[PDB]
């Protein structure tokens, strides 16, 4: 179940999560630091809130028939956390469970 | 020929809804309008409305809108296209509505216009308790 | 400055009416949409759902019967009640706030839009243990 | 009628620049053989109106090489490349397809 | 060419050459169908279900995903195949819930060939040798009574055939004013033609994205069913401009008050009822037929002193035009997001 | 309109066989010839051959026989008869065969002859290792 996103630091990580898209969607990306609470990183399809760091780019949600991705550049040791996607598809019903965890480990 | 058959008379409770089925036969039913006229005793005649059976284009008198409704049923077979049914649904009854109802057809001639009728159903008494 | 504080009994027998509390900071109970989320150990979280004053009381259809959320305007807390604790209930539980948003894709007059939610901040948790 | 719609009326045009006066008809002005008969007028205050072009393109004899007509169907635009003081005043459209013919309203070139 | 010192009484109401054109267009409409496929093998038991969508309890979906047995090119084997249909073409035959087509209890149906189009084209009528066609060229002329300036012609001008019930489209513009015309306005059983001058632009669209899917019924047979819908299941609709419509009603009220006294309340209302394609208004937009609710225009009253209007439509696939007893026409679904632009020109 | 779409350019090893599909659309494909012509760099043009798709009657140039082959495929449906495919198979490759190939059609006018071409495919680069 944990997909291994082993990446060298300074490089680009691409995390895929969730079901293949049918309608227009809205994705939310979270993260889970070990031993701690969750925290949001991305709230719209390509929008991050205030105070959060940059370099977390999101795919636009108008693509019809792909999987939700998340582009990170220049990772570090503090970025070691499990990830979760949370899609809102305008055709499928309300998702009462998150995606499957894509753990992130830096080289 | 042209034949026009209605249903029988009816006792109805006040505030109810009534249905009258005027059945026509002997002519191509998709061509001529069907009008509805009422006779109240000691009031004279009174127009109600008309229907065109081709699409169910209806039109009602102003002082009875919201209360009356019309439907039609065509004949869908390649052998008997002639017979047609018109239904009147009439709601919001008063004891003043006790009267006699007629279904009529336009006269078949070319120069006679829309309103002067020729044929008449045998008339149905509607009596309100 | 906002943070929360969960508290439960901690050691729970099966077939028991569970209850939980959540203390607030800065933002009072009236202001914002609240949400409870569970997460089993080593598993994805399970969004149990959200609550707000004045008729915003939608629940998860998974449980749907044995869970009732509650508020505390007097002491300014958020509380929860579960009925019939089972063995799968051993999960760390999170009270949290959330923010709305109207995602619009078609014509607004034809109801061609939908509301999404997202948790801005989180709590600390309490490992509710189901055991004999 | 087949009344012409002139656009625009007033054109204050500086000396040396271009000018464009369009007409739009209600119908097509196609004569029954193929040759539409369009005409463009002059007018100064105090002179009789006289002709510059008598076709879509072919011009009255004696008209210099700066005025040109073009267009199709309903839309027919006059174009003057270099505007002098003689060009000031009221211009018109004119039809030749079928009687009765209709003049426009009058399009003034100014400075 | 023209003609002088001449006056002829006309008529539009007891005129001929319209009585033969309604026969001509129907008789020509039938000829473009007989070289195409019949749908005898398709009136069959259907197994339907809802399309994948967030469905509500109160409001309802409008597409049904249906699967059914079907023949192959060969006669021994059969196949299972599925398509999408609208709510207005299946009825429930009577746990499970199985449907059937609507027109199968009255008439087998003709698929139109997808190669031919239904777009309008100019038609010029012409009179043969030994006749003539006169044309009134008056400005103020209500269509009945003597025209004082006639003009003969060899053939008529551009006459395109459209199909629409309310709000006729791509019509002929009035000259300067707005003209109402009728046979006898104190009578009501005759319609009232209203022809105005400035055309109201109307946009109409379906934003859904289709896919056609060929199903071989037998030798040389192709049932073009609807494949999958990519994107957002959305509703077809039309737009008109608010201010232009509020203006053009203001013109026709000024015209209507000439026949009824200046001190008269004039108001407008939705259609009184009946079958489908007389309450709404219908049209064909690039090979597909709409039925579009027009309550959003006729909601007014008129005292004797950036936005736009959307109005939602419905799409049937089988038509029953001219209400013929042995006739229907399955229309082929067309690809992509579809729209068209037109000129509302007259009212009825 | 008349549209001619070829395939893409390709690396090929020496001594192999190369297939090039010229797809035509926008006209009745059963009527006109399809010619194949090559452009070698620093040689000028060079004719290759022609095909008539009605029966697939082919004809080749002299100095390329035994090496070229032409096939065609029609549209067999009463709905979309317009589109057609012409395949060229070219064998016995040399490094001199690195060139760019073109499929063409006869000019559509009635007075136009058989050779002067109007419509041209976008050209396919063939390059030999
Ligand atoms: C008839 O008239 C009606 C009434 O005016 C018209 O209805 C309007 O239709 C338009 C579009 O059809 C609609 O516009 C929306 O505006 C929203 C708010 O600005 C936009 O958010 C939205 O675009 C987004 O969604 C699309 C589909 O998902 C994306 O493809 C698009 O790129 C936008 O997505 C961006 O933003 C999101 C934000 O999260 C992001 O996730 C994406 O990655 C991307 O960055 C629509 O365009 C209007 O709201 C409608 N209503 C009104 C009142 O104007 C109708 O169009 C008219 N029809 C015709 C034929 O004229
Ligand atoms: C009232 O009057 C107006 C004015 O004519 C009508 O509007 C026209 O409607 C027709 C048919 O609905 C439109 O014709 C269609 O246009 C489509 C758009 O393509 C245009 O643009 C592309 C891109 O530049 C050009 O390549 C192309 O030549 C067009 O200019 C076409 O895609 C359509 O072709 C489709 O159908 C044919 C049918 O044989 C297929 O074979 C094709 O493969 C293709 O799928 C078609 O040509 C026309 O564009 C409209 N005009 C304008 C200005 O938009 C209204 O329809 C009319 N009102 C009513 C109710 O009919
Ligand atoms: C799928 O569609 C259903 C349609 O019922 C959506 O459920 C509804 O969502 C609304 C929120 O947009 C819920 O709240 C309501 O909001 C209004 C506006 O504030 C409020 O006044 C009402 O009192 C109500 O609280 C509504 O309860 C809810 N209904 C149900 C039955 O769940 C659902 O969100 C859609 N899901 C997706 C993923 O599209
Ligand atoms: C209309 O209903 C039919 C019912 O058969 C739907 O077809 C089936 O749709 C399901 C998904 O809902 C497909 O299952 C999926 O298949 C893929 C690949 O085989 C697999 O990776 C998935 O895990 C899942 O099993 C199924 O293949 C498909 N069958 C056929 C014959 O198409 C159809 O999708 C429905 N249409 C709409 C618009 O909902
Ligand atoms: C003209 O405007 C009036 C006023 O809205 C429309 O009357 C309304 O019509 C709708 C649909 O027929 C009625 O809705 C209800 O829908 C439920 C759905 O199941 C049904 O059970 C009810 O019996 C009823 O049909 C609505 O009640 C009705 N308004 C009133 C006050 O009765 C009328 O439809 C409009 N005309 C046209 C041609 O649309
Ligand atoms: C499929 O569609 C049918 C009919 O629309 C649904 O059945 C009922 O639909 C009405 C209105 O949509 C609801 O008010 C009822 O509650 C529905 N009944 C039931 C038992 O759900 C049906 O729900 C739809 N979905 C499925 C999965 O069959
Ligand atoms: C298509 O044909 C098959 C073959 O008969 C149908 O399958 C049978 O359906 C009946 C009634 O539902 C069952 O009693 C049989 O047991 C089915 N056969 C088998 C082998 O299971 C099928 O229902 C038809 N329709 C569709 C949509 O597939
Ligand atoms: C159409 O116009 C004609 C004449 O312009 C009208 O005919 C006359 O109308 C007046 C009053 O409307 C009557 O007094 C005359 O007796 C009519 N003459 C004839 C020969 O009919 C005609 O009424 C107009 N029709 C409409 C519907 O406006
Ligand atoms: C409707 O769906 C079709 C599905 O094919 C879309 O066509 C695709 O469009 C994308 C966008 O450029 C292309 O990359 C694909 O190659 C197209 N597919 C094919 C098979 O050609 C079409 O764009 C959709 N309509 C709209 C308006 O988006
Ligand atoms: C109907 O659609 C057409 C599409 O071309 C509209 O025409 C353009 O609309 C845009 C609006 O974004 C304007 O900015 C352009 O100036 C319009 N073009 C022209 C030539 O005027 C048209 O406005 C639409 N009509 C309505 C009523 O919505
Ligand atoms: C045409 O549009 C009108 C405007 O929405 C529709 O009327 C509404 O119908 C709903 C129920 O379907 C009612 O709750 C609303 O009160 C109605 N609005 C008004 C202003 O009365 C109408 O239903 C549409 N036509 C059809 C056939 O559905
Ligand atoms: C609808 O009517 C309008 C009239 O305003 C037409 O628009 C003009 O058409 C002429 C002839 O094609 C053009 O020379 C003008 O430039 C058009 N004016 C504008 C503002 O576009 C229009 O062609 C008609 N048809 C449609 C489909 O809109
Ligand atoms: C066909 O079936 C419909 C659905 O019940 C019904 O209303 C109609 O009367 C039927 N047709 C005939 C001719 O009976």
């Amino acid at each position: 179940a944990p997909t291994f996103v082993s990446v060298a630091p300074g490089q680009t990580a691409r995390i895929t999560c969730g079901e293949e898209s049918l309608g227009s969607r809205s994705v939310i990306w979270y993260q889970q630091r070990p031993g701690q609470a969750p925290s949001l990183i991305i709230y719209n399809n390509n929008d991050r809130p205030s105070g959060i760091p940059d370099r977390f780019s999101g795919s636009p949600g108008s693509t019809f028939g792909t999987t939700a991705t998340l582009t990170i550049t220049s990772v570090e040791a503090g970025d070691e956390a499990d990830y979760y996607c949370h899609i809102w598809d305008s055709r499928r019903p309300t998702n009462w469970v998150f995606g499957e965890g894509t753990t992130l480990i830096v080289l | 020929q042209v034949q026009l058959v209605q249903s029988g008379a009816v006792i109805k409770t006040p505030g109810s809804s009534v249905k009258i089925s005027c059945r026509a036969s002997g002519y191509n039913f998709r061509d001529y309008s069907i009008h509805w006229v009422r006779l109240i005793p000691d009031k004279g005649f009174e127009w109600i409305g008309w229907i065109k059976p081709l699409w169910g284009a209806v039109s009602y008198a102003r002082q009875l809108q919201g209360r009356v409704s019309m439907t039609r049923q065509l004949s869908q077979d390649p052998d008997d296209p002639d017979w047609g049914v018109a239904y009147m649904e009439f709601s919001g009854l008063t004891p003043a509505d006790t009267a006699e109802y007629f279904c009529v057809r336009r006269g078949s001639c070319d120069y006679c216009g829309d309103f002067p009728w020729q044929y008449w159903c045998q008339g149905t008494v509607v009596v309100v308790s | 400055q906002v943070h929360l504080q969960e508290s439960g009994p901690g050691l729970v027998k099966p077939s028991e009416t569970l209850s939980l509390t959540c203390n607030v900071s800065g933002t009072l109970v009236r202001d914002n949409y609240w949400s409870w989320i569970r997460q089993p150990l080593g598993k994805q979280p399970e969004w149990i759902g959200y609550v707000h004053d004045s008729g915003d009381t939608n629940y998860n259809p998974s449980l749907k019967s044995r869970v009732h959320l509650s508020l505390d305007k007097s002491k300014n807390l958020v509380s929860l009640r579960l009925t019939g604790v089972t063995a799968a209930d051993s999960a760390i539980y999170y009270c949290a706030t959330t923010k709305h948003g109207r995602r619009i894709y078609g014509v607004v007059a034809f109801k061609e839009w939908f509301t999404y939610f997202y948790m801005d901040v989180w709590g600390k948790g309490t490992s509710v243990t189901v055991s004999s | 009628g087949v009344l012409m719609t002139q656009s625009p009326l007033s054109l204050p045009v500086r000396l040396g620049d271009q000018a464009s006066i369009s007409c739009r008809s209600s119908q097509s002005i196609v004569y029954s053989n193929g040759n539409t008969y369009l005409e463009w007028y002059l007018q100064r205050p105090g002179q009789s109106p006289k002709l510059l072009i008598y076709k879509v393109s072919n011009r009255f004899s004696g008209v210099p090489d700066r005025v040109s007509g073009s267009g199709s169907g309903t839309d027919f635009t006059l174009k003057i490349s270099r505007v002098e003081a003689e060009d000031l005043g009221v211009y018109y459209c004119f039809q030749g397809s079928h009687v009765p013919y209709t003049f426009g309203g009058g399009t003034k070139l100014e400075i | 060419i023209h003609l002088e010192n001449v006056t002829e009484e006309f008529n539009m109401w007891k005129n001929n050459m319209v009585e033969q054109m309604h026969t001509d267009i129907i008789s020509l409409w039938d000829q473009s169908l007989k070289p195409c496929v019949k749908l005898t093998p398709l009136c069959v038991t259907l197994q339907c279900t809802n399309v994948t969508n967030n469905i509500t309890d109160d409001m309802r979906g409008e597409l049904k995903n249906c699967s059914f047995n079907m023949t192959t090119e060969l006669r021994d084997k059969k196949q299972k195949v599925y398509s999408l249909f609208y709510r207005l073409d299946v009825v429930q035959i009577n746990s499970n819930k199985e449907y059937r087509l609507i027109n199968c209890n009255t008439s087998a149906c003709t698929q139109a060939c997808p190669k031919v189009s239904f777009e309008p084209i100019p038609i010029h009528y012409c009179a043969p040798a030994g006749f003539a066609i006169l044309k009134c060229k008056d400005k103020k002329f209500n269509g009945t009574g003597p025209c004082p300036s006639v003009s003969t012609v060899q053939c008529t001008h551009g006459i395109k055939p459209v199909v629409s019930t309310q709000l006729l489209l791509n019509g002929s513009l009035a000259e300067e004013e707005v003209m109402i015309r009728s046979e006898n306005i104190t009578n009501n059983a005759k319609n009232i033609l209203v022809q105005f001058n400035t055309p109201v632009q109307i946009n109409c669209t379906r934003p859904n994205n289709n896919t056609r899917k060929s199903i071989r019924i037998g030798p040389g047979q192709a049932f073009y069913a609807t494949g999958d819908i990519i994107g957002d299941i959305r509703q077809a609709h039309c737009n008109v401009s608010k201010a232009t419509w509020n203006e053009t009603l203001g013109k026709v009220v000024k015209q209507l008050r000439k026949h009824f006294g200046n001190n008269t309340i004039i108001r407008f209302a939705n259609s009184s009822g009946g079958d489908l394609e007389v309450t709404t208004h219908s049209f064909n937009c690039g090979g597909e037929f709409f039925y579009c609710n027009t309550s959003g225009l006729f909601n007014s009253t008129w005292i004797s002193n950036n936005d736009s209007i959307t109005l939602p439509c419905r799409i049937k696939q089988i038509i029953n035009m001219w209400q013929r007893i042995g006739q229907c026409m399955y229309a082929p679904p067309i690809q992509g997001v579809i729209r068209c632009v037109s000129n509302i020109t007259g009212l009825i």
Side-chain angles (χ1 to χ4, degrees), chain B residues 91-114:
Chain B
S91 64
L93 289 172
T94 64
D97 294 329
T98 293
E100 191 172 4
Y101 293 152
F102 294 95
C103 63
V104 286
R105 192 184 72 87
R106 185 175 68 85
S108 68
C109 65
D110 51 354
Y111 180 76
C112 48
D114 50 357

Side-chain angles (χ1 to χ4, degrees), chain E residues 200-204 238-242 244 306-309 339-342:
Chain E
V200 176
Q201 179 173 355
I202 175 170
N203 286 321
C204 284
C238 296
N239 285 330
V240 296
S241 179
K242 186 77 171 180
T244 62
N306 296 115
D307 289 332
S308 65
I309 293 171
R339 66 103 167 270
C340 57
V341 182
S342 295

